[PDB]
Design a protein around this nucleic acid. Structure first.
Lengths: 53, 53, 49
DNA sequence: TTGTATTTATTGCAATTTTCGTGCCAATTTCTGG
DNA sequence: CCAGAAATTGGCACGAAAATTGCAATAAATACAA
């Protein structure tokens, strides 16, 4: 009773047109984003504490 | 020297990173090894010597 | 299918309610024998060990 | 004509530990004569 | 056949080379109001 354990690679290397192509694993590359809804209220007409925050 | 950085950056970047190749899954640190002098001015990596043995 | 020599009559309750009585010569001649083919797969993967 | 607040541009050293190869020797396996 | 005499290996030590981490906020270019 058991099952083997795997590791998700960080870098992929393959051979295309006789040349070695190297890239990052697109399924595991971290990324972020800026929330436009909260950042779109950065207007001086609002409170100054809110603006500096 | 090849990428024009310090050795500390190379050491930190290649910690617990995994590379997938048509041969298998390896570590980025797995490709660094010592050498043993070969007659004629050549060098032999310890990994190659272990494989030969 | 196959061409069969057939009679329409009751036979001792063995063709009761859409039952069919078949001769042994039909079996001996392999007239309704079929071939079935099945596939099995073994996958060898790569692990961390 | 200029002085100030904002936006990007900064991913390298120097101790310090860990590891590399390799020689010396003492406790085990093989080589040779009556 | 058997006992006295020769190779084998792993621990320990040596210098030297290499991998590791503690340094945590700075400086230069650019736009605007007097």
């Amino acid at each position: 009773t058991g099952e083997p354990e795997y590791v998700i690679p960080d870098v992929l290397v393959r051979k295309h047109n006789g040349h070695w192509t190297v890239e990052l694993n697109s399924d595991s590359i971290p990324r972020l984003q800026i929330n436009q809804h909260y950042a779109s209220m950065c207007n001086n007409a609002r409170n100054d504490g809110d603006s500096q925050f | 020297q090849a990428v024009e950085m310090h050795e500390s950056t190379i050491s930190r970047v290649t910690t617990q990173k995994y590379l997938h190749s048509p041969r298998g899954i390896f570590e980025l640190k797995y490709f660094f090894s010592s050498h043993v002098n070969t007659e004629g001015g050549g060098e032999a990596s310890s990994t190659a010597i272990r494989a030969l043995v | 299918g196959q061409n069969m020599r057939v009679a329409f009559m009751p036979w001792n309750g063995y063709n009761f309610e859409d039952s069919i009585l078949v001769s042994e010569r039909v079996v001996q001649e392999d007239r309704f024998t079929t071939i079935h083919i099945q596939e099995l797969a073994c996958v060898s993967r790569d692990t961390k060990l």
